[PDB]
Amino acid sequence: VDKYTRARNAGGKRAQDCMLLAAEGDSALSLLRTGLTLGKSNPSGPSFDFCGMISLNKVLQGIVQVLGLDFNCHYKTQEERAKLRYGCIVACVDQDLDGCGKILGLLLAYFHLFWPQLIIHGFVKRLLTPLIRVYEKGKTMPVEFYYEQEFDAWAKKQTSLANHTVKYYKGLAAHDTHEVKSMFKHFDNMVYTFTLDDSAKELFHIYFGGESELRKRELCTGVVPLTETQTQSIHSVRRIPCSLHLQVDTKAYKLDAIERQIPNFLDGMTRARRKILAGGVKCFASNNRERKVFQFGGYVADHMFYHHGDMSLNTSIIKAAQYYPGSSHLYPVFIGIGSFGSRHLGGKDAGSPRYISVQLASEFIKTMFPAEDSWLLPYVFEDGQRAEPEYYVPVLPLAIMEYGANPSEGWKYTTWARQLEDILALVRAYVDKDNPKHELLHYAIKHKITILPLRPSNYNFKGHLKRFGQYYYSYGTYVISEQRNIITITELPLRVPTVAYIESIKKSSNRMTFIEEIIDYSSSETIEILVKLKPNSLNRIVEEFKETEEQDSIENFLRLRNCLHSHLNFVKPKGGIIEFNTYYEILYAWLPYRRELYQKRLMREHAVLKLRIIMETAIVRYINESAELNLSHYEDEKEASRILSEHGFPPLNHTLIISPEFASIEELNQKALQGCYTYILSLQARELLIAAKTRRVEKIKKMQARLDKVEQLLQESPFPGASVWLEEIDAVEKAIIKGRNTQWKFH
Amino acid sequence: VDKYTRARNAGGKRAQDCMLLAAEGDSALSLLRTGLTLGKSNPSGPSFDFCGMISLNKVLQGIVQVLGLDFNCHYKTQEERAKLRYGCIVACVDQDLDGCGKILGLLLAYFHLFWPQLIIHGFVKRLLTPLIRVYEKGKTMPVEFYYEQEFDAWAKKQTSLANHTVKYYKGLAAHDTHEVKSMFKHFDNMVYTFTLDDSAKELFHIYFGGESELRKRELCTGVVPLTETQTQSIHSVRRIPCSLHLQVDTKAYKLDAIERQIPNFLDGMTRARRKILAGGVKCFASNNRERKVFQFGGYVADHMFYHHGDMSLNTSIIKAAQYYPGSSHLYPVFIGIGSFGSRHLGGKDAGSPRYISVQLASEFIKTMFPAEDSWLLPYVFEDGQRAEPEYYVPVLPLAIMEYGANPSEGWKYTTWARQLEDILALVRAYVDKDNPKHELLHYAIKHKITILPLRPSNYNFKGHLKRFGQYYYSYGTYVISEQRNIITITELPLRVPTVAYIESIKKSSNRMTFIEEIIDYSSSETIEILVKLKPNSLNRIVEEFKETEEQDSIENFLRLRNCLHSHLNFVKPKGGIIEFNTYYEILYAWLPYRRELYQKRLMREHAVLKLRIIMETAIVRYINESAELNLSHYEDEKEASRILSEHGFPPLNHTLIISPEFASIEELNQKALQGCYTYILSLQARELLIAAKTRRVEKIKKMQARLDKVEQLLQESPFPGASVWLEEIDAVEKAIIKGRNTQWKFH
């Protein structure tokens, strides 16, 4: 067997004392080799005298061959087990979702399917490695945690983490050489044994069986973290229940795989698209200069922790910067500068990422996603670093205002964008206090009924939308020239590529008996396809493809019909998969999430406003009293701070009060008043002038007026921030109108 | 033909008036479609009434089929040409090296090989597009340049470029929609015609023929830019000579392809490795925190314009961060944190980029590549943005101090690292004024002779190096255990992977007749391979593989011999390929480049030192006179600057004097004294204290002493900066020793 290293006693008298270390890949094999050949010191550590290696179907067949297993045996007796060359198999896979959730889960499912008795009595093991290590400055022995719950619980009891650094080891390749030495020093303590319980059989049949309905039922709930009692139990007994592993790690892997293709219902974007939007907001905030697609993709991968390859990242950026009839985004995030694709090839004809550049639609992004509300969203922490937020809460329900189509592993996601006017009317009726049927909409939301209609978006569509039964249909347009005996196709159904449509028409021989030649003469936006028919066939086409009520004979001939199928599957904010029936439900579910955000916005802005008022008042007082103070007479920082303290100047946190980027209201109240005199001692010479003093006084008056206005808005009815919500809705509508007027190029 | 659109009159009465637009790809096809269907305005513009499209072997066969060409025809008469369906073929390729240098060159070579008369009388055309566009703030009509020489010449005559923005269009996908409209408005003016001259046949046979020696001769010189007279001629006559295109664009493409695999002799790194090193220096300058491989690759692609895929970038970063016996880098740039690879698989067993992290070797990089010398190197400008420098000039000849092996398109590059001690001795003898045979080394350099020897690096090699004839050989080590009848391999030849060696031994049946089993029991660094022989074969092995003077019988048996072949092919600083014979020549060629850099360093530091002395003197004067000035009494910035001017304070450029990042000596002398009073008006309140004043006075005294020392160093013999060079050599040696002592992990 290739990439297999045997031991001295494998298959010998003490073969039962041997071990087989199943490595995930080449890096795992290198780590195992480094650990095993380490036996020049600490002789108690493992070596090749009893431990072999193997790399992880042909792979499972090889593992069976090295293990000397028999497919016709059940291994219910010790004598039957004695024929095995190795006493146990240990899987050395990484702690990430792809390694321990997929490969280890597949190995466990295979062993349970073929030899359950080996798992029951104990034959399959895994090598737990320290997931998180905390290093103390000056201390040589780190604090090692095997689960994130342990690290979190330990951190809650720590006074301060300033002198502590946290390193996450989710992969076997992330362990340094000295850490590998330390791990293989205690190797005998870090290997656990799998145990099969009663619920484990059912859990295995749910995750790895052919029963898709049970899998969909199981994936409807988020990941359940291991309880502290369970963590203590597994650490004490040195045994992993198979059911617990399947319920935690495999479920997390499956939910992460599904989450990549199915977006949240609050913002209508997946994790990758959320990362891209956050990176675009961060990059183009200072200056909205054009940046190339590969450069911006590198920036996103650097800042928002986008570990996937550059191909998918560049494709997603291009798709987010695309704007053409039938595109996925009716309101794309980025302004495309160059050739980003055409409707004929479905956007796949975009230019190379090295040539096309991307620019952020500042007027649309700054209004739809307010910058002041970005500090209140829950953020995703990747290895201790703050990545993109868990979900965006835009001013309007972006999940239903844009086209979407993404298949999944069993699930289907397909949405057709609703009309902007109807959504705006519904949201305004919900928000506006004095507006017809405003209380009626509240009653409708309370009793889950619909009053105002939602219609599919007819923009960028030179056709007519018709409803029949409970489904929507989009029709194309055609003209007939009897003189030349041709049919000119002027518009295709919604989201139908021109090249794909032509190929589908050509691939049908029956239609080809009547069609002589098809030429694509369409523009970039306008469709013009000339179909030449054979002599004396138009009457035959009408006779064969009989005209029906649903579609005309020509429409049946040319496949000028589309079905607006809608599968409203989305991801809940706290994990899991949620299924909606109508877009009304998505709107009514998204409304409270945004309604609750304005109150937090207003309270945080009130507290921060008080803090800025205090600081600017103190600064203006120092500006007025600088001549009396004569700060240059004092020697160092300590004496200056002391004399500033004698004059009653309050000590404030300069860094946090000015920039409370992610501080809560309680944090602001408890910490912002425990700083130093930097706010005075760091004032520049140009700020001592009368012009700067007058500007600061005017700013203080404006902040006081804004504080009073914030109090009034907090006292507003029905909910705080209703008028602010209406103003933001109007701004978003104006930005969308300006974008649509200028081909989504704000010039 | 797939992806082909015909015209109305193609093959008709006016078929000679038709055109065939050969597009490079899907983006070129989209641009051509947008331009052709644009004919709703400006009817003089081209349309589908006379212009068709086609996408660019099967491709050439398709082009021939649409053109209706005959392989048995020469097309020497107009009547023969009249049978053609299209009057001419126009290649729509991008202006970059890969598009117009490779695809267009290949098409021209094909047409010249098969139908030269079509090129001679005129049948192959190309579509020139504006490469560079300059936009004036407030002006609607940009200034379009088709070559970089035109833009450079226009820029030399401009007073200031602050109000001008420069956009480079090297790809067809980089043209915006309005720019595409403007281009197709003048389409009839922007299409040129290819002409075949006498030297064009020879140039075609050199570039596309089978004569590799002529290609190597041609690639020995850098790219020759088009002369201004030639540019005016081609713009006036609307004709591109084939010889000029081959000599410029194809030569540039070939030189860029070769340059990617062959490094410069001044620093021993290719363009990608130079970009990676510059990005690492820029990223880890502020803080040397660990960063993941994919994150750092994204940062490099964002900052240093690394347009290649993330796979190659991550592989190169991993290779630059690798450290193991037989690795490419004896002194790797980055400190590898994790599993970056082992000698058994040649470094291909590295972990995933998502898990392993990279850290910059600050102590080695800051000493080998001085930060003060990074401002004087010539930099590469990518689309107007300053990318990595053209070449690095380290303290020591890094090109010959590290292993290297990179094949090329006809060329071979393979270097074996020389001993550090011998190189240090030679460089010190060159630099040190009072050192034995110092003048002797100068005479040797003058007359191109060798005095002190260079030997291959024996570090990290548990074997003996022997020289026979003019070649070097590396021998492995083995032991024989007659009791067990086995041979234990303890060390492999230089740069020989363990797995590859084992597979090569196994693949030889003759050696396998004597070998029963081979097991790999080697450590991460130490090799231990046990080879079991069949009974009574050791004497047979000795008898068959006869012992010779060069290698022992066992060494011939196990292939424990390597040949230290050296191909010293490098890239000149100003383009081209240079071939050396011995490492002595590389050292003697690299020495003057570094010798000349110290003088520029010293002069620039002298001028900058004078400027800092002036600014700090003025600042200290203002600190002393602040109480008298009473700056708070004046209203705005203008009045404060005026009163500061009355007191005789000099106006200096605060931004440039403090940070002259890329200003030459003449620029420093001419511009640094034409600023404002920001250096005084931006002083913080904490800087007015007596402690800050004392610190500034001490800094002024230190700067005066350093200015005197810089004058003394400029007056040094034999060349300025000799003592500084010796100090930097000692620092580099100490850093290398510290790295080698700590496994290249500076802890």
Numbering used by the authors:
A (entry chain B), B (entry chain A): 415 to 470, 502 to 1192
Sentences from the study reporting this entry:
Interestingly, 3D classification revealed two distinct classes with almost even particle populations, generating high-resolution reconstructions with C2 symmetry imposed at an overall resolution of 3.16 Å and 3.13 Å, respectively. One state has a closed conformation in the C-terminal dimer interface, and the other one appears open. In our study, two distinct P1192R dimeric states were observed simultaneously in the cryo-EM samples, with their DNA-gate closed, whereas their C-gate is closed and open, respectively. It shows that the conformations of the DNA cleave core for the two P1192R dimers are nearly identical, with a root-mean-square deviation (RMSD) value of 1.25 Å for all Cα. However, the coiled-coil arm of the closed state rotates inward by ~15° relative to that of the open state, thus leading to an enclosed C-gate interface stabilized via extensive intermolecular hydrogen bond and ionic interactions. Compared with the yeast topo II, P1192R contains an additional pair of E817-R1046 salt bridge, which is retained in the closed state while disrupted in the open state. Since no DNA substrates are present in the cryo-EM samples, we consider that the C-gate could adopt both closed and open conformations prior to reaction, and its status might be self-regulated through inter-domain interactions. In our study, we observed that the P1192R simultaneously exists in two states in solution, with its C-gate closed or open, providing the first experimental evidence to support the previously proposed model. The N-terminal ATPase domain comprising amino acids 1–414 was invisible in both states, probably owing to its flexible connection with the other part of P1192R. Besides the ATPase domain, the cryo-EM densities corresponding to the region covering residues 471–501 also could not be traced in these two states.
The viral type II topoisomerase encoded by the African swine fever virus (ASFV) is critical for viral replication and infection, thus representing an attractive target for antiviral drug development. Type II topoisomerases can relax supercoiled DNA by a concerted strand-passage mechanism in which the enzyme first cleaves one DNA duplex (G-segment) and then guides the second DNA duplex (T-segment) to pass through the transient breaks. ASFV P1192R contains two conserved domains, namely, an N-terminal ATPase domain and a central DNA cleavage core followed by a coiled-coil arm, but lacks the nonconserved C-terminal domain (CTD) with modulating activities reported in human topo II. Similar to previously reported topo II structures of yeast and human, P1192R assembles into a large homodimer mediated by two interfaces.
